[PDB]
Amino acid sequence: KSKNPEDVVRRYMQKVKNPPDEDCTICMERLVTASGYEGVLRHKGVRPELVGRLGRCGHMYHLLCLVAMYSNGNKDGSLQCPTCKAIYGEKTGTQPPGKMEFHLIPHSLPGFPDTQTIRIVYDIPTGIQGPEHPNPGKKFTARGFPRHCYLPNNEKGRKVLRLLITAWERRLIFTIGTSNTTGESDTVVWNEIHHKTEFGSNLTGHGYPDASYLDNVLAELTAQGVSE
Ligand SMILES: [Cl-]
Numbered sequence: 376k377s378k379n380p381e382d383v384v385r386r387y388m389q390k391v392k393n394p395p396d397e398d399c400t401i402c403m404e405r406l407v408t409a410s411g412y413e414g415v416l417r418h419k420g421v422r423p424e425l426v427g428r429l430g431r432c433g434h435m436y437h438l439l440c441l442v443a444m445y446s447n448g449n450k451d452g453s454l455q456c457p458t459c460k461a462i463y464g465e466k467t468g469t470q471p472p473g474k475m476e477f478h479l480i481p482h483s484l485p486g487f488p489d490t491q492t493i494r495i496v497y498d499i500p501t502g503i504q505g506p507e508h509p510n511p512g513k514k515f516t517a518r519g520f521p522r523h524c525y526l527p528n529n530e531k532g533r534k535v536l537r538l539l540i541t542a543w544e545r546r547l548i549f550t551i552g553t554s555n556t557t558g559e560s561d562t563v564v565w566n567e568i569h570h571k572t573e574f575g576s577n578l579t580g581h582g583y584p585d586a587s588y589l590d591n592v593l594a595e596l597t598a599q600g601v602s603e
Pocket residue numbers: 554555563564565
């Protein structure tokens with residue numbers, strides 16, 4: 376679906392024909408008067424008097440106010456109610472094309488004795504940045520691919536695997552930006568979901584044993600709108 380502010384916002388807003396004499400809590404003007412937003416998106420846009428009820432919670436805003444607010448955020452397809460903090464829609468990212476593969480290997484991770492290991496392999500080729508990327512039309516590099524990641528094949532590890540597949544499908548695993556280890560810009564980097572790339576030790580901090588890892592990555596996934 377389109378992630379453009381006006382389209383996303385209109386999707387979750389339901390027109391209020393006769394709004395009350397109460398504040399819009401985005402612009403702090405009354406709902407029976409025009410939106411207080413005065414920026415560039417007003418030009419030939421949403422009529423400033425239009426008011427809607429947002430999603431399931433029903434909180435009411437000038438439609439223009441909520442498109443302005445959404446446009447000042449990440450514009451990731453999800454829309455948060457500023458009154459009650461309910462989130463509507465699905466967060467997606469800018470991960471470029473590639474391949475995600477996984478299978479089982481007959482080796483136990485440190486801290487998960489007598490198990491097999493889920494080996495995940497991500498492969499992302501170089502390409503041209505698209506309109507969703509920081510420098511549209513500029514080439515982007517992709518370093519260190521294929522990247523190998525590991526989870527134990529136990530109940531919680533399989534759960535993480537299901538959720539990583541969803542995050543991959545929502546283009547959330549990788550993004551295009553600046554590497555933290557090299558400083559290179561216009562390059563494929565990890566996004567907000569940590570992976571373990573070191574199998575038999577944790578000298579890098581990205582390895583095992585790590586008894587908190589599975590719970591930690593489940594929280595990161597939930598922070599990206601990916602949960603069961
Ligand atoms: Cl990276």
